[PDB]
Amino acid sequence: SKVFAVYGASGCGRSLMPVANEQLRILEGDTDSQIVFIDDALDDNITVNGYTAMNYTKFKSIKNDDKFVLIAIANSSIRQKIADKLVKDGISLWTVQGMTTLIMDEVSIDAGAALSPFVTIAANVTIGKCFHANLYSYVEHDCIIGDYVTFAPRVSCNGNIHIHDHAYIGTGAVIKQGTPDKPLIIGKGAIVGMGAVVTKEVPAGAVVIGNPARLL
Amino acid sequence: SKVFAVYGASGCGRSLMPVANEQLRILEGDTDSQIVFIDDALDDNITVNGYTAMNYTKFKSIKNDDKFVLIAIANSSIRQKIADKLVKDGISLWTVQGMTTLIMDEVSIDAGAALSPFVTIAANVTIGKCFHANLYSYVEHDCIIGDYVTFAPRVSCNGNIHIHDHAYIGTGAVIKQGTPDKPLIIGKGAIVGMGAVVTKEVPAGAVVIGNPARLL
Amino acid sequence: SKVFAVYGASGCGRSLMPVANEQLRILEGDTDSQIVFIDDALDDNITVNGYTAMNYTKFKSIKNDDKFVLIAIANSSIRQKIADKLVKDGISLWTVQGMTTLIMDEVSIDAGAALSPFVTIAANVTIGKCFHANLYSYVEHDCIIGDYVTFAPRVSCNGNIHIHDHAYIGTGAVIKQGTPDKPLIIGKGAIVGMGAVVTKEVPAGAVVIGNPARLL
Ligand SMILES: CC(C)(COP(=O)(O)OP(=O)(O)OC[C@H]1O[C@@H](n2cnc3c(N)ncnc32)[C@H](O)[C@@H]1OP(=O)(O)O)[C@@H](O)C(=O)NCCC(=O)NCCS
Ligand SMILES: CC(C)(COP(=O)(O)OP(=O)(O)OC[C@H]1O[C@@H](n2cnc3c(N)ncnc32)[C@H](O)[C@@H]1OP(=O)(O)O)[C@@H](O)C(=O)NCCC(=O)NCCS
Ligand SMILES: CC(C)(COP(=O)(O)OP(=O)(O)OC[C@H]1O[C@@H](n2cnc3c(N)ncnc32)[C@H](O)[C@@H]1OP(=O)(O)O)[C@@H](O)C(=O)NCCC(=O)NCCS
Ligand SMILES: CC(=O)N[C@H]1[C@@H](OP(=O)(O)OP(=O)(O)OC[C@H]2O[C@@H](n3ccc(=O)[nH]c3=O)[C@H](O)[C@@H]2O)O[C@H](C)[C@@H](N)[C@@H]1O
Ligand SMILES: CC(=O)N[C@H]1[C@@H](OP(=O)(O)OP(=O)(O)OC[C@H]2O[C@@H](n3ccc(=O)[nH]c3=O)[C@H](O)[C@@H]2O)O[C@H](C)[C@@H](N)[C@@H]1O
Numbered sequence: 064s065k066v067f068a069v070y071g072a073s074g075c076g077r078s079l080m081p082v083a084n085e086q087l088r089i090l091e092g093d094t095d096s097q098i099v100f101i102d103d104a105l106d107d108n109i110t111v112n113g114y115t116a117m118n119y120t121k122f123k124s125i126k127n128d129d130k131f132v133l134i135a136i137a138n139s140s141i142r143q144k145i146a147d148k149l150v151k152d153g154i155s156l157w158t159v160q161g162m163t164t165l166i167m168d169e170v171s172i173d174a175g176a177a178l179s180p181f182v183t184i185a186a187n188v189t190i191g192k193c194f195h196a197n198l199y200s201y202v203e204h205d206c207i208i209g210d211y212v213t214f215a216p217r218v219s220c221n222g223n224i225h226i227h228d229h230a231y232i233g234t235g236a237v238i239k240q241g242t243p244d245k246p247l248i249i250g251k252g253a254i255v256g257m258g259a260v261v262t263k264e265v266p267a268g269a270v271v272i273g274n275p276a277r278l279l
Numbered sequence: 280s281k282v283f284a285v286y287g288a289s290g291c292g293r294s295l296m297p298v299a300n301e302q303l304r305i306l307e308g309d310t311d312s313q314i315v316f317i318d319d320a321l322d323d324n325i326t327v328n329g330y331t332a333m334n335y336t337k338f339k340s341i342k343n344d345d346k347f348v349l350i351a352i353a354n355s356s357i358r359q360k361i362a363d364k365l366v367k368d369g370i371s372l373w374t375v376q377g378m379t380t381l382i383m384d385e386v387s388i389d390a391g392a393a394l395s396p397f398v399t400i401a402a403n404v405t406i407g408k409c410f411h412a413n414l415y416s417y418v419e420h421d422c423i424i425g426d427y428v429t430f431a432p433r434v435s436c437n438g439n440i441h442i443h444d445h446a447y448i449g450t451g452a453v454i455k456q457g458t459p460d461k462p463l464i465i466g467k468g469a470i471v472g473m474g475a476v477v478t479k480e481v482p483a484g485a486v487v488i489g490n491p492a493r494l495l
Numbered sequence: 496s497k498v499f500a501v502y503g504a505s506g507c508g509r510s511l512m513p514v515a516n517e518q519l520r521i522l523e524g525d526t527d528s529q530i531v532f533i534d535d536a537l538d539d540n541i542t543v544n545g546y547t548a549m550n551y552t553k554f555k556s557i558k559n560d561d562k563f564v565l566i567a568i569a570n571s572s573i574r575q576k577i578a579d580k581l582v583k584d585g586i587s588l589w590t591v592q593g594m595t596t597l598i599m600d601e602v603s604i605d606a607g608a609a610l611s612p613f614v615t616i617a618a619n620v621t622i623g624k625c626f627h628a629n630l631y632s633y634v635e636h637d638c639i640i641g642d643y644v645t646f647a648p649r650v651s652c653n654g655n656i657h658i659h660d661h662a663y664i665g666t667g668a669v670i671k672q673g674t675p676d677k678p679l680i681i682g683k684g685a686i687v688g689m690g691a692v693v694t695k696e697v698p699a700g701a702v703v704i705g706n707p708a709r710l711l
């Protein structure tokens with residue numbers, strides 16, 4: 064027996080719960096296991112979109128040895144804090160993808176990814192911990208994505224890009240491909256703004272916006 | 280028995296007729312009902328892409344009590360005029376979606392929407408009359424869309440956005456999310472240009488273009 | 496009996512080989528025919544993502560009268576050179592599309608197109624030789640695409656656009672629709688940059704970038 068959850072019942076989680084249901088009911092063929100929301104804003108249990116929603120204290124108290132959690136909180140500092148808590152409490156991180164999520168050949172994705180509908184992860188891609196690939200995003204060939212990286216919808220991450228830990232890529236941003244000899248790097252904790260057109264390396268901790276992308 | 284139609288046999292209608300066929304033949308499982316084009320440019324009936332195409336006078340004359348019409352005219356002033364005519368003549372507005380259109384939980388859409396392939400309508404969204412969501416568009420969580428709103432392809436409408444009546448959002452435009460306390464508003468009859476990156480409220484009747492969006 | 500190949504085992508080919516497998520195994524229902532990579536960088540055969548990869552000399556030497564090749568090299572000058580070689584050696588060009596590629600009514604596409612996942616080719620479109628439509632691209636109604644045209648991912652080619660031979664359209668570019676009386680023309684060998692917002696005719700051989708698009 065198993066219990067599933069989406070951690071976060073705000074916008075990120077409410078737009079991922081249908082995806083977690085595709086992952087569980089269809090891709091895993093599991094019509095038996097329960098799925099709930101976890102949200103620490105809750106004191107008493109409530110329902111959110113027809114699912115039971117409870118705080119983490121209550122989720123921990125469930126008498127099941129086999130718990131699986133998708134963290135659906137876009138803020139990657141929160142997501143890492145929760146992931147470390149879950150692993151320490153013996154709860155499994157759970158990767159979710161949609162029926163329309165396309166995964167190509169020789170792709171490695173660490174546990175706990177949120178891979179939205181219409182996402183493509185192309186050939187020979189490696190992705191670290193609790194990746195968020197929101198609706199329509201793609202990661203093209205030979206990319207290396209670090210831990211707790213977050214894509215907004217419709218991110219165009221072209222080939223031979225290396226995105227370091229905790230970077231955030233905003234809605235509709237486009238990143239130029241690297242080459243085998245020179246991957247294009249997005250530095251640790253960098254923020255690429257909505258609609259940014261990135262044609263050069265982004266330094267660690269930089270905020271870049273516009274077409275062409277510039278420091279903000 | 281029933282008769283279906285796509286009103287408009289120009290570009291909007293010719294790119295929606297396949298979608299209306301997915302809605303009718305597959306999602307409704309109806310292999311019996313006829314589907315035609317209506318276009319008031321026509322005097323004599325013709326064929327358009329292998330479908331009978333007639334003017335509205337001829338469509339009205341069909342002896343069937345049960346008529347269902349998708350209005351496939353992007354101009355929302357025309358679309359409202361036609362919708363009011365259809366309802367007054369006792370013809371039903373008909374929502375169409377594609378096989379790849381994704382509708383999430385607790386979504387309310389008024390009759391007569393044109394929901395193209397690869398469209399996502401995310402959680403807890405409310406949409407008014409004869410919405411056009413062209414190819415690849417999305418409406419994220421907690422949005423409220425008014426009546427006769429029109430999206431070009433690939434519109435990225437993020438969460439907690441309120442789009443008032445008759446707004447037009449152009450190809451590939453990106454709109455920043457609001458918050459629960461402050462929805463980002465697109466005003467009545469506003470025009471957001473192709474590729475605009477919108478990060479603030481757009482006044483009623485405003486035309487905005489560019490990255491960042493500015494008045495035109 | 497038949498033999499299939501993807502010509503190019505770098506990023507373009509490795510992200511198209513899964514698509515060629517959808518075309519062959521599912522859309523053609525062919526679980527018998529072998530599929531390999533061709534790449535002229537190779538001396539000895541190798542494997543690429545679990546497929547045999549060989550140079551063109553070795554592919555020619557295969558004793559099969561019935562060879563079918565998708566050219567997965569984005570550079571259109573190389574693609575034309577290879578296509579002319581294949582036809583002269585009595586090898587067939589092979590169109591590939593994905594399970595999620597949407598083709599609408601009265602569409603004409605010459606042999607050898609690479610039509611990626613999530614691509615839409617809308618109503619009444621005509622496309623010439625070895626077209627590349629990378630992930631998420633669309634070509635809307637009444638477009639005429641010439642020979643050896645190349646789209647990056649997420650190109651938004653709106654209606655009544657004429658793209659002449661060997662043009663290249665970059666990632667996420669948006670092109671304004673033409674009208675029946677005045678198609679918007681992208682000239683022969685023009686380059687439209689990533690994220691460009693094109694609202695006017697692009698001259699032959701021009702390079703245009705930005706929002707709005709300007710000469711580079
Ligand atoms: C880039 C970003 C991080 C800046 O955040 P911020 O520092 O809070 O920015 P503000 O909203 O205060 O705006 C700062 C200024 O830059 C502009 N700006 C903000 N984001 C911009 C963007 N993506 N492109 C261009 N200009 C932008 C604002 O209009 C403002 O201009 P002003 O000083 O002339 O009034 C943010 O705007 C962004 O792009 N976030 C991603 C949103 C998103 O992708 N949503 C998806 C969730 S599903
Ligand atoms: C914004 C828009 C409404 C302006 O329409 P318009 O007033 O007829 O504009 P024009 O074509 O006369 O162009 C006005 C000027 O702004 C520029 N411009 C037009 N649209 C622009 C856009 N989206 N972004 C930036 N600049 C734009 C033009 O190049 C022109 O510049 P110029 O005066 O230097 O020559 C229109 O260009 C647009 O974006 N419409 C949406 C197209 C679309 O989404 N198609 C989808 C159908 S499937
Ligand atoms: C437009 C393009 C062809 C220019 O190529 P290039 O001539 O080699 O350009 P460079 O990389 O030398 O950049 C030239 C300058 O223009 C800028 N630039 C490049 N591409 C740009 C773009 N799309 N938009 C805006 N500015 C751009 C660069 O930042 C640079 O600025 P600088 O001189 O201030 O340093 C190229 O950048 C491009 O857009 N190619 C498409 C990439 C793509 O679509 N990938 C998909 C493959 S899956
Ligand atoms: C306001 C905003 O920009 N939200 C955007 C954000 O939504 P999130 O749900 O990630 O963020 P939030 O709206 O701040 O909500 C976070 C939720 O996490 C919960 N939480 C938190 C910490 C914790 O330790 N436990 C816990 O449970 C917290 O109680 C809250 O319900 O990213 C999405 C991808 C966007 N679509 C959405 O618009
Ligand atoms: C030229 C242009 O920009 N067209 C764009 C427009 O196409 P539409 O078909 O909406 O607009 P149109 O090309 O002006 O055609 C309108 C059609 O509606 C018909 N009609 C009208 C009024 C009426 O009362 N009865 C009636 O039938 C009219 O006869 C005509 O055939 O929006 C699409 C989404 C775009 N893809 C397409 O490029």
Ligand SMILES: CC(=O)N[C@H]1[C@@H](OP(=O)(O)OP(=O)(O)OC[C@H]2O[C@@H](n3ccc(=O)[nH]c3=O)[C@H](O)[C@@H]2O)O[C@H](C)[C@@H](N)[C@@H]1O
Nearest residue numbers: 222240503504505506507508533534535536568569570573
């Ligand atoms: C570096 C770069 O920008 N690559 C981009 C390019 O990849 P390509 O595979 O088209 O280009 P390449 O990386 O230069 O590789 C070309 C390949 O074609 C091969 N080849 C060539 C000639 C010939 O006559 N025989 C032959 O076989 C050549 O040996 C090589 O393996 O377009 C894709 C759509 C992008 N995703 C990808 O990032």
Ligand SMILES: [Cl-]
Nearest residue numbers: 199415631649
């Ligand atoms: Cl898209």
